Amino acid sequence: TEFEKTQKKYQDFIATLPKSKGWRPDEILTQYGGHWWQECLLEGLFHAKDHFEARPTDFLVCSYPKTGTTWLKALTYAIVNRSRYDDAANPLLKRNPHEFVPYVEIDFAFYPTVDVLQDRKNPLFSTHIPNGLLPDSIVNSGCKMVYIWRDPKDTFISMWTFLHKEKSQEGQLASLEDSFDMFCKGLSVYGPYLDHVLGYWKAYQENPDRILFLRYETMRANPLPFVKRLAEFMGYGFTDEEEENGVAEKVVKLCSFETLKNLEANKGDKEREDRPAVYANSAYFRKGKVGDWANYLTPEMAARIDGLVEEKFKDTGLLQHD
Template sequence: MPPRANLFDFHGVSMVHYFTDNWEKIQNFKARPDDILIATYPKAGTTWASYILDLLYFSHKQPDRQTSAPIHERVPFLEIQIPCFPTGTELADSLETSPRLIKTHLPVQLVPKSFWEQNCRVVYVARNAKDNAVSYFHFDRMNHAHPEPGDWNGYLQRFIEGKMVFGSWYDHVTGWWERKQSHPNIHYMFFEDMVEDTGREINKLCSFLGTTSTADEKEQIRAMSQFDNMKKDDMANYSTVPIMDFKISPFMRKGKVGDWKNHFTVAQSEEFDEDYKKKMKNTTLQFRTEV
């Protein structure tokens, strides 16, 4: 396992070196007009959206694709650079698919400008803050590329302050939401909607992307992308990634809405809600914490 990284300020966003070491190549990345960027705050449904998009575009053209390569090779993580592995930009540059599916956790202001210049389509997935914080906490416990999370109480405080890898949840979700208002090429999805009715959200995605999947194909994709199926799938569940310690927690833990109730005390929840109202008062963006 690599040593745990330390958090530092990077252009006003908390980061670790694994996502900034390759910065020049990230910023100069050459997007193509048909690239699709899958953007999220960490632990908001990134792998789920990546998996659905991968199936939508390639399940009929390359039926063995889902079993022959892990999702992080099929949908490279643009900003990652971990020693002894190809960087995210190298993996993205070596993709031979059209479209190329590329994932990022960067806040909107740090996305390489070629994605905007080429008018690429972006699928953004957002998840309510409480569940996102819980999921991120368990992820940080098992992911050695991130700082040690400590106990839940201290962690929640840092989440509120935005001292997380990839910065503040509040800035991230609202930054992308604001950008969407002027960029029709951003499709903004909610994790809670995906849990509530995956089929409906796949239909919306197809309308946005202009794909011509049949009702049968969409139903098959809906069934394949159910959480329990993906959790068992070694090509989707990140069990092949050496920096993650599955003995501590699986990468795909519950995939539920409302698990925050098993972690937040009443006092924590009230304090969180108070702060949340202040931070979110100037946005039209709204979340559900239960479905």
């Protein structure tokens, strides 16, 4: 296949890259371009470099994992499609949001025949690729992008708990404290996390008309103004009639944690139906809170990561942005 040709082409290169143990005993992460990768994800990056073609009308969802990706896939899909479906007919009621917004470095690489990637109408894509490594076609298209980030303490806990749920990996996971130590040293997939955020922040600073820079915690506290802003930014702003008819509030409720978690499609061990999964859909909806780290980390571990944040973000403007 075309992806198998990519894998062969970069085999020798990827073998020359530095390698490290991950959070599972047998897991090997590879370093490239300041960031750590699973092998297949780095193959997926090069495949996208060589083959992904962005259009100016595309809209790209960007995040580091466990900062709000599922939520933004739902929101962007609902914003785009709200006039295509009667409320009860919305496909989000029936299928996990990841089925509707394909990943550049995963779905486009590993699963290029899924229906949404064959749909010439679809404008929505997502990625965890660091900003400095995005394919030139994406950079050159001028397509707009949204980036979301989250408190590193909550982001870490979201990841460590999620990884207990991966198929055929029971017991294969480092302790909380050892996992936290490698997260803080920047050893995580797509990490270092703080470098990931800073990369998009600097892009936002340089191109503030092209990137909407969002924070999980402020959206969670007060989602309606942010959803309206996102829809506007996307080019699908809510009209005055729509606001009269509560349509923006309907989108917020449909994409809320409380709705999606309780859908039949996202419960139990049910998996997505478009392509193979190593997670049940239910693994994407855990607690949805701000501050759950308080139940796992000591003041000493909090001070460590909070000190890393102050040092990484010093003099950048990031923590001031509202």
